[PDB]
Amino acid sequence: MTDQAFVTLTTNDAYAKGALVLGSSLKQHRTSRRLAVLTTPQVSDTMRKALEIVFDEVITVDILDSGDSAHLTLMKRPELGVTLTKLHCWSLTQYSKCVFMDADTLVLANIDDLFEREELSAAPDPGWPDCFNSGVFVYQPSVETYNQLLHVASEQGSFNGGDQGLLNTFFNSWATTDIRKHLPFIYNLSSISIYSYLPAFKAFGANAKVVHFLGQTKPWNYTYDTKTKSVRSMTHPQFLNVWWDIFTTSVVPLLQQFGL
Amino acid sequence: MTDQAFVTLTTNDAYAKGALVLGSSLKQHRTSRRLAVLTTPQVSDTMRKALEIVFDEVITVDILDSGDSAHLTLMKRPELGVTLTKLHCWSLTQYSKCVFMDADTLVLANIDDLFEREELSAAPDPGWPDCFNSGVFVYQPSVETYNQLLHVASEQGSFNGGDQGLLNTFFNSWATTDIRKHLPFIYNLSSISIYSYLPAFKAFGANAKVVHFLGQTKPWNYTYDTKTKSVRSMTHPQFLNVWWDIFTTSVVPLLQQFGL
């Protein structure tokens, strides 16, 4: 309850919009858990103030500062900035167990049952299914684990240049051990898989609980018609429309409260 | 040993080339198991004679014949012809356990350890990872199971129009039960995943044991230069070159034995 939380990350204003929509969707589906968001100094004051309303806790992380424990690793491997910032989710020891969710995900149903899982639980990644997708995962905050992950980042880096490579390298028993740590795909449904693999989606897609907007174009990169309530042109804009309905209904008017 | 086997299927001459290469690769990597191939009447006499040399057993199946148990289901759902023919793999009760492999797969290392698995064991399918790819799977021949599968095909059909949809619908506990039934991806490596997901492949691809040639273009659809020993233009033609080396070295000269 109070010691468990959903955790996300925003390094800029664009992803802050995603985090705001994500946080709103979790509230919409009545989560009994806390909502926390890791933010960097590059996030504007207005976005930060909006985040302070949607989330129960806003934690500032600045790996560009010499006082940060990951700073030295960043100097060694500067392309891992976002990854190192994300790793700070393990530093949130005020929580006993958390569900990390990237700011480009969207909740479609209550997913509090994820807290029944143990670290490290995650859904299979499409493309190379023996690796888990790091967009949604159940973990246990721990300074020791954070230090171990930072050590791996320093010595090995990441095989994909991002957090997914590093996380799979560290939590390497995932593919061959404990089916319970394999979160069902509906808890982290790839937006790509939805429009690509039509048969499979038509058969199981209705049970989707979380949509993960992957690819170059993010939800906020689309144009949304507020009258027809649909984005402009693609066989299932339904999820993009849900994202935009929440953004239009709850997020934008919230951001307007600060103009006064 | 004698009661265990690798089983494949050929419905035409093009796939017969694939089966011949597959069977040859299994021999190349010294399998201690039997090799069986299901064939239809549309396979030519010369291809059939080549199959009789590579495989220990060549079983003819003709679902177009009224005497076949699947014929009636075919009349009801004619688009399932290939699927119904493939289902006959469960009718091979002379074997206690088999590993089915599509004719468009290629073995790169001994995979006899697959016989330690139980029905139904298969690797995750890229695209919708909560479904297993039906290109490679461990099963137990049984008339009862065959009848149950045919019953599902008749009543429900297949959600993807092919054998994968039907098999996943029948063996539906796969995604959430028993991690041992999740064959490692290297036992059925998608050719698409190899050229697409470069990072992941670069990291784990060297351990590939079986390559599954997916997509429209099959190995036999490429042009192969026998001098340079490489197909014509694509960041990893290595596997296509292995396929063609076996085809050039063992299969073609075998097919020439019959011209005399």
From Swiss-Prot, chains A, B:
Its recorded reaction(s) are: L-tyrosyl-[glycogenin] + UDP-alpha-D-glucose = alpha-D-glucosyl-L-tyrosyl-[glycogenin] + UDP + H(+); [1,4-alpha-D-glucosyl](n)-L-tyrosyl-[glycogenin] + UDP-alpha-D-glucose = [1,4-alpha-D-glucosyl](n+1)-L-tyrosyl-[glycogenin] + UDP + H(+)
Q: What class of enzyme is it?
A: transferase
Site note Important for catalytic activity applies to 86
What GO molecular function terms would the record report?
A: glycogenin glucosyltransferase activity; manganese ion binding; protein homodimerization activity
Q: Bound how, and how many: what does the cofactor note say?
A: Divalent metal ions. Required for self-glucosylation. Manganese is the most effective.
Q: Which residues carry this modification: Phosphoserine?
A: 44
- Subunit and interaction comment: Part of the GYS1-GYG1 complex, a heterooctamer composed of a tetramer of GYS1 and 2 dimers of GYG1, where each GYS1 protomer binds to one GYG1 subunit (via GYG1 C-terminus); the GYS1 tetramer may dissociate from GYG1 dimers to continue glycogen polymerization on its own. May also form a heterooctamer complex with GYS2 (via GYG1 C-terminus).
Functional note: Glycogenin participates in the glycogen biosynthetic process along with glycogen synthase and glycogen branching enzyme. It catalyzes the formation of a short alpha (1,4)-glucosyl chain covalently attached via a glucose 1-O-tyrosyl linkage to internal tyrosine residues and these chains act as primers for the elongation reaction catalyzed by glycogen synthase.
Protein name listed in UniProt: Glycogenin-1
| Gene source species | Oryctolagus cuniculus
Q: Which residues of the full protein are shown?
A: 1 to 266 of 333
